[PDB]
Design a protein that fits this description.
The structure is a homotetramer. By secondary structure, chain A is of the alpha+beta class. Chain A has one domain: Gyrase A, domain 2 (2-Layer Sandwich), CATH 3.30.1360.170. In chain A, strands 1-2-3-5-4 form a five-stranded antiparallel β-sheet. The radius of gyration of chain A is 21 Å and the shape is elongated. In chain A, 48% of the residues are buried. Chains in contact: A-B, A-D, B-C, C-D. At the A-B interface, strand 2, helix 1, strand 4 and strand 5 of A face strand 2, helix 1, strand 4 and strand 5 of B. The structure holds 5-fluoro-2'-deoxyuridine-5'-monophosphate (4 copies). One 5-fluoro-2'-deoxyuridine-5'-monophosphate sits at the interface of chains A and D. Chain B: It comes from Thermotoga maritima (strain ATCC 43589 / DSM 3109 / JCM 10099 / NBRC 100826 / MSB8). Chain B: This is Flavin-dependent thymidylate synthase. Chain B: Homotetramer. Chain B: It is an enzyme of class 2 (transferase). Chain B: Its EC number is 2.1.1.148.
Chain lengths: 220, 218, 214, 216
């Protein structure tokens, strides 16, 4: 499962541990019980969600491989209850890959210049900065220092391991109109994968705990 | 990474319920920083020892385990102090607890010259435990709320819980519990955890024991 | 500031860093007068912006029964240091519920009688403990016969945001009555040190019930 | 206490709870005696008993380039609040390495030339940013053309234990030079408020190299 986001980004599911039944089992232990039947365990997940019993969902875990603009990764990395490993700018020569907003991105705003022109000015800086970047490196300048001229729309990559509860906290904040449109798109891809792996939890989440808005109108 | 079970103490156990990833999971995560991926067994295994040597612990957070543990409360209280993990435990306020208590064996006193025979100690612990539990059943039978009746049950009462923890946090756990300074009872559980860890992540475990393990019993 | 809880417990403030203004200042980095500042706090509280409150921290000294502490310690976003039963000799102090504790419940055994059976078990258990210790049994082993109502003490450092999460879960009728009592005390001290943040909490974020009543 | 770092940054102490005795009170779980207390602090540090130190907490106000903040924010056991490029118009403040930053490296061009090149692109990027803003382009979007050396500001609340882990990782020759500088400033303030913990830290637990060199 690899979903393309923006012009060169993506969200890819690397691994997963457990499913909806992992949470049912975890929660049953409190009552010294185990699993029962579909409509029973399905009903439990709904009960847990509607009453704020979040811990059982911590037993479901995902590992994603994500490609995204640094300005997006900076917001993303603010989520502390998860694990990260990202491409290093001091240890690797960075690739010429930047997020160039589509002209449609400015749709809904009165601008003095045409969207196409905006798109042009951004690319201009990008090409100029990257050119400066390579020149510095070829001149013997350390990579960790040369990359400081690169803009925030530069694409980075990282692995993200997070449990289902933290993932839902993530969705409440990023799968929402108040978050920047760009990370909203990534949150959609995360939600789609989460739905595929934990349908019962996802549904119960949208129905009883989700606090954002976009997931109620969009599909998957 | 599907199933294993080890019995601890007289009625306890550590059972592996699930696992996500393996040694290569850490290799992949670490390589991303250099914009690379997996290489060969030789180079990849070399990286794991390299990470361990210089204390690059983040890559190992991508390896996750879920255990199902049965242990006495005094052990659980020590265990639960490890904050970077997830738990769900049997509830004394919601369910009727069973007559299961950890009774130390006479050998648990080996090295300690006691006034009364060790067997005597074992017997006296069983006695108090039996009395407390009978009082518990009596209060429950008489309508006393479960959450109140259980307060008379002793610390060696067995409890059960699910524990999800990543490899990095697991190694932190072993540095502290797989050590002669930790209480013997929890050392036993730590040894079982180490056995399952070793089985699921040979390279990581081996590198851990050789370059990072701080304890003295593994 | 100290508050007695149950029959022999307590919660006392040891230290605190910051106040309502600490949250205002931290949130002001993203982008005054009492009016504008307090309005900001209600604004942050209203919209779920919890991070600014993490810059206010408390340290409590708590005395409570182990069964209460076991629930309390499940709150991971905080720091703890508790008395050790394997290193020090344990004191003869247990929580004996008052007869009023079983109020509302129709029990075959009179509430006063229930209270007595608990004290009885506690007494016998503690004697066995001392008996074992004097026989040469190490403390870490002898203490396993002691009941869950044994009192313990610990230091608790927690930020305002985490404290509010604690109040949502423990200052509620669903939580066991015993810990509800401690949560009330915790809330009282929080109110004293952070009135604006506290008022805004009850008004827009607090999910429990008892703080709206008591 | 405010220490300047790099060319336009700084580390400033906003608040602090407790001192060395706070870890002592916590470890004993009670409530003085310098000899005893200091000995205990050393004992704890020597045998890996770090929890008592979580009871000492600092709040800093930091100004640093984004590439530095991105490394800094990787420290999860702490609290942050940072200036937002989505809601605020950003100021023309960037970190321009001095020619001295590249002394010790064989470059095919004079260090001053690297300074000029970095500053030129920075200047062009900012001008575009301003033109985009004036044009009505949203801030959250207009700022994506701004380079990684843009200065940001944030409040950082962290306990002494977590602060020591930060020092271990950042106050070390392996960490990028720029964050090393911030780590030194953090250490000085820490040493100022908790002299006993700091000395015990360097003596028994500190894993980095630089702090045993440059004093305070
Ligand atoms: O929607 C937002 N999400 C987010 O995570 N930040 C955090 C990320 C970073 O630490 C700092 C600056 O963010 P930005 O420039 O994107 O506004 O605040 C800010 C926002 F406005
Ligand atoms: O010394 C380093 N410190 C650090 O915190 N990172 C993290 C920060 C970020 O999440 C990603 C890219 O860092 P950078 O481009 O500065 O190398 O890895 C990388 C290093 F090499
Ligand atoms: O080896 C130990 N491990 C541990 O986790 N504690 C913590 C657990 C509990 O929260 C409190 C009292 O522990 P105990 O009575 O087992 O000594 O301190 C204490 C020890 F001595
Ligand atoms: O209201 C509760 N609060 C709580 O923190 N637990 C946790 C504490 C402990 O880890 C385990 C057993 O709790 P208890 O026996 O008090 O029900 O579950 C359980 C409850 F029912």
């Amino acid at each position: 499962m690899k979903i393309d986001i923006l012009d060169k980004g993506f969200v890819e599911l690397v691994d997963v541990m457990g499913n909806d039944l992992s949470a049912v089992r975890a929660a049953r232990v409190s009552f010294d019980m185990g699993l029962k039947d579909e409509e029973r365990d399905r009903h439990l997940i709904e009960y847990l969600m509607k009453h704020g019993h979040e811990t059982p969902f911590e037993h479901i875990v995902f590992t994603f491989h994500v490609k995204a603009p640094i300005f997006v990764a900076r917001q993303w990395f603010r989520h502390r209850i998860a694990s990260y490993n990202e491409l290093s700018g001091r240890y690797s020569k960075l690739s010429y890959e930047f997020y160039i907003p589509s002209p449609e991105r400015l749709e809904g705003y009165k601008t003095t210049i045409p969207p196409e022109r905006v798109t042009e000015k951004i690319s201009e800086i990008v090409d100029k900065a990257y050119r400066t970047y390579l020149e510095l490196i070829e001149s013997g300048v350390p990579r960790e220092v040369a990359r400081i001229v690169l803009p925030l729309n530069l694409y980075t990559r990282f692995f993200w391991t997070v449990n289902a509860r933290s993932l839902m906290n993530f969705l409440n904040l990023r799968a929402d109109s108040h978050a920047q449109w760009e990370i909203q798109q990534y949150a959609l891809a995360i939600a789609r994968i989460f739905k595929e792996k934990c349908p019962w939890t996802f549904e119960a989440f949208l129905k009883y705990a989700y606090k954002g808005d976009i997931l109620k109108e969009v599909q998957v």
